[PDB]
Amino acid sequence: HHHSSGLVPRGSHMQVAVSSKIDTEGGVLGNIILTVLNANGIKTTDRIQLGATPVVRKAITAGEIDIYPEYTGNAAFFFNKADDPLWKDPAKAYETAKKLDYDANKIVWLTPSPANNTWGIAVRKDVANENKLASLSDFGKYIAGGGKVVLAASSEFVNSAAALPAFQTAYGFTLKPDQLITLSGGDTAATIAAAANQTNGANAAMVYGTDGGIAPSGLVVLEDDKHVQPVYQPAPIIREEVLKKDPKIEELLKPVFEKLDLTTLQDLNGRVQLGGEPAKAVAEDFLKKNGFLK
Secondary structure (H helix, E strand, C coil): CCCCCCCCCCCCCCCEEEEEECCHHHHHHHHHHHHHHHHCCCCEEEEEEEECHHHHHHHHHCCCCCEEEEEHHHHHHHCCCCCCHHHHCHHHHHHHHHHHHHHHHCEEECCCCCCCCCEEEEEEHHHHHHCCCCEHHHHHHHHHCCCCCCEEEEHHHHHCCCCHHHHHHHHCCCCCHHHEEEECCCCHHHHHHHHHHCHHHCCEEEEECCCCCCCCCCEEECECCCCCCCCCCEEEEEEHHHHCCCCCHHHHHHHHHHCCCHHHHHHHHHHHHCCCCCHHHHHHHHHHHCCCCC
């Protein structure tokens, strides 16, 4: 519990510019941050869904925005450490992102969500339930044992060394030609839809962990328990100049992001993306339901 008096002069004023990247999850997480700050007496400006990652990074380093949700693994790209094994360890990825961004930019990484929004595989819920599949280790054993699988994936996912081939060696399986639907120029919208509709027998799909299509389509993400992919946990990151004046922002956002687990964020993103609920309303509902809006 930080102090909220005596830190700055009587006349100190601030408008906290809240932003995000220009995807569904950015809208959801940005509105969660904005709503929490507003509810705790802090003035904000709404710059949510400003642009792609490079745009938002340029904006925060220029002091044009103050706080937005960023993903731990992206620090690999910001600081020229791509494919370093540490990014595949959730704790190391977070601590390293936090240290690098503080040292270079005095940007403070706050408490992350436990959701790992990374490349992966989701299966139809009936398949997961009947065969007790929760993890990619489970999945690999199931496939190796002769389990029925037809995976819809983009060509990139099938053929890039870091994608399906790496899943195959980590989890001990290989997919035969008749266990693959390969989508040239495809995307997760199409792979999710193929699995949702069992197109050509599809029962699994290439996804990103919190894709808004997953929950509405009745799919379930299998845990990357050996972390084949780099970890991308979202966290609020904030300019130190702003945090120093309202340091309570840290403890205000901590239990909020702790409650945003994978299935929760999946649900919120789906409510916007396929349910048509406004991101602000979805954010407010999540906050009210979990007691963060007294």
